[PDB]
Amino acid sequence: FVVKDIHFEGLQRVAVGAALLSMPVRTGDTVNDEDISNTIRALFATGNFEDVRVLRDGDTLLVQVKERPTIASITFSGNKSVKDDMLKQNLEASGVRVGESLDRTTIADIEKGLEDFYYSVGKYSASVKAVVTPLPRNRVDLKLVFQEGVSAEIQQINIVGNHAFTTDELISHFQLRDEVPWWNVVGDRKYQKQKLAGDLETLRSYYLDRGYARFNIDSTQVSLTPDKKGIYVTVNITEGDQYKLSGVEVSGNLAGHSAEIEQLTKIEPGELYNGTKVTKMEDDIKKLLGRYGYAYPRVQSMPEINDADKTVKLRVNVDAGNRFYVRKIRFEGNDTSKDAVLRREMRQMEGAWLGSDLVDQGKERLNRLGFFETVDTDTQRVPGSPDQVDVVYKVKERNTGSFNFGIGYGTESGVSFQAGVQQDNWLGTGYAVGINGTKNDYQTYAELSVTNPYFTVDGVSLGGRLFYNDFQADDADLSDYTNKSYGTDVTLGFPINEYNSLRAGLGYVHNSLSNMQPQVAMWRYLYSMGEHPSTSDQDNSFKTDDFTFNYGWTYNKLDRGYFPTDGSRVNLTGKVTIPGSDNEYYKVTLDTATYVPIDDDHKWVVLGRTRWGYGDGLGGKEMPFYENFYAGGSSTVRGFQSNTIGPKAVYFPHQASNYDPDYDYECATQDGAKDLCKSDDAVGGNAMAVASLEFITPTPFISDKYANSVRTSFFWDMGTVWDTNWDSSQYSGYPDYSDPSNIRMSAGIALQWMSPLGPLVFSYAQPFKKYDGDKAEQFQFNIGKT
């Protein structure tokens, strides 16, 4: 059929030219039913037409069409556990979005797509319904009603084919979980393929690190319940007999470094095969070949196994590649942070040969700051150069600083409140400013802190701090005296070994003392400082302004921060007053902790802690009684009331502030007092020595599935505190508090784990050696921050 003209009926958005173009048929050509059908199918395939009809009028080829209504909006109702924006992102990734049209036959398809998304997020009983609201001008809105349903949780994780290790002991090291008590923070009970693969790798490693070279995971099975609210996992394995490590043999283009390697491949012939050690050998060889310039030194380890004698022999293939040089290092995504903040963390220098280990070190260092959510690397090449590359770090900035508030309870500090506002990246500079405050039963503390972590390129820091501190003693199991102090401090920090860290700084502190109970150990200092207050009254005030030089050293080698199993921590702090200050004294403290394991799985440990301290005056003066040392409590010596170990107060005969019988008073004249007066309330001492030997064991009655999160210990604690300036000749009848032989011992049990309320630590101790005046407190616990 010859066509002399073309006409359309229904073209609203698509122009007439677009239609005339897409059509195989054009004006002035012969047409048949086949070409008409082709045109109709093309119009349908354009994705903008719902119904098409190409008929023949008297002379004209008339095209009727009902354009698919243009989508004007996409609403949602019932996306509790799914964000509207993410759902819309998934939708517009599927194809449907605003501006486009609505295919009136793909409704169930989109419903099933969203259902599949829900199936992927965990929910399997979800129902999606797409309602369609027509509107004039051939527009339509698409509403999506979601019935989420109830999530599916794991009810069991089983492992079959294991005979040497119980299944619980293996699940204990998984990221998935089947049991989640209400008194522990061990994880959720959800299912994800990534976690499953990670757990399979953890299992494979747990076996390969024990000699089971032939270990093989036959298959995995995931199953549901007919109600689709429970998930079951099954893992079949085949653990083969243990294998020994007979020897090692290297071969490849070692680059003449065959000498420096054979010392890295030294073993005791007849060792138990292990995968971690093999990977460590490979990484060491790679680090060496990087030290010699090579950037991509491939290393492969192939084991030749012999079952007749059960001997493994490793075959290491080394392929040291070519040297690559770095021309640039770029950072994109740092809209707030400056380039220096990201560059000073790079261990790979621009303008030098390349090392991938250094690039990874830089990436990790950038991850630690906390200013970036994601950190990706890309080593692009250079157009027209086979030995040059440009490194790129893509970063996504995060909300830098936080508003932190937290509570806790405990026997020592009663109820403890904390509140602070912190900022870690002040205008993208690295400065960390903050305002913090704490409040407990016996002190308020408020500090304003600032610090530049790079006052020098190497990593030296420079701090700064203003602080206000109110301290009541009667609330701390001591003699009565109130100290309100304010001051400022500045300190530098020098890192030297990646474990050791020195620090040195200056400080000014103003102290005001008031509401002081007459007792000898106070006068011994007041007199020294020229004062001559009275004994028969406690309206006594004393102000001092002191300048101090503070020094310190720290050593940290613990394998872990939480529940360590091997290493040692050490801290030395010191202070000395420099001339000009009213007070003349020096003070020193030394804390030490040492964890020593006695097994291979690190479940039996021997912990040893010590705490030494000594201070004294210089110009015939004494040390301030508000800088003294205190022992007793859940940190030094357990089983004793906090801050009761050591010297006691020797009161004077003195009227009281306001007398009211039925209240216990400490030797007031209004009760028949005419001479000095022993007491049982502590005052502290200028010298202190504390030790603790603890034995950590596994929790015996709790399931092995999550018994690795609870720490059980049996401890033996010792301590003593004493005053060196107590003149035992003048005050004869009362004991000699300058005798360090008065050692206080205790022994008992302790538990420690993590709870939603916060960290928990319980302890029951029974002091068997204690002296007159020491108050016992067997049960002690510290739910929360402190």
Binding site: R139, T336, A340, M349, V457
Partner: protein, 209 residues
């Protein structure tokens, strides 16, 4: 929630024009999205796209302005008033840049855009401002490179310093940061005991300042 009645397009557009002139953008925005959605093929939908670019720009909704600009350039690449769109693209990138040590990629994009505009259409009204912005962006990028060189001088690297200052003398020779960076190259050449090049750098310096 900024509900819009179904009045005919004339009054909605007149109200939009009657709210822009006052200085309120969040309001006319809504009206323009309505008139766009409700009439994606009306007689003046393009005008609406231009007004929407303008509104998103002055309302700080820059990513949407970028999307609108890309869409408009794709759908109407030969629109007589397309120079306006390129100028708005340059302005949007400049605003995103918003601080010379930070990421300069937005500055490079703005430079490329303004270069396209000025080379293509030099007899426009949006060109002189384009050059006044290109000079500023050039200086900004040079200052970024200078900051990097200063860091690597503090560190102790003496090859990165000279490479980057050579790159500046190559790309950004006619700025002031470059004039302020030659001493760094001199110091680097001297620290590596290559004095025959420090002398050349000094010859360059003394011939300008």
């Amino acid at each position: 929630k900024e509900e819009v009645p179904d009045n005919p397009p004339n009054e909605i557009y007149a109200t939009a024009q009657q709210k822009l002139q006052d200085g309120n953008w969040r309001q006319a925005i809504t009206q323009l999205e309505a008139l766009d959605n409700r009439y994606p093929f009306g007689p003046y939908s393009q005008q609406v796209q231009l007004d929407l670019i303008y509104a998103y720009y002055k309302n700080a909704d820059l990513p949407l302005a970028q999307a609108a600009i890309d869409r408009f350039i794709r759908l109407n690449p030969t629109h007589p008033n397309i120079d306006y769109v390129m100028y708005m693209r340059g302005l949007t990138n400049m605003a995103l840049d918003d601080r010379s040590d930070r990421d300069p990629q937005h500055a490079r994009a703005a430079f490329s855009d303004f270069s396209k505009l000025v080379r293509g259409y030099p007899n426009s009204q949006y060109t002189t401002d384009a050059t006044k912005r290109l000079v500023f962006l050039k200086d900004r990028l040079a200052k970024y490179e200078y900051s990097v060189a200063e860091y690597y001088t503090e560190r102790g690297a003496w090859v990165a310093v000279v490479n980057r200052v050579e790159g500046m003398l190559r790309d950004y020779p006619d700025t002031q940061a470059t004039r302020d960076a030659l001493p760094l190259m001199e110091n680097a050449y001297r620290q590596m005991q290559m004095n025959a090049q420090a002398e050349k750098v000094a010859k360059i310096i003394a011939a300008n300042s």
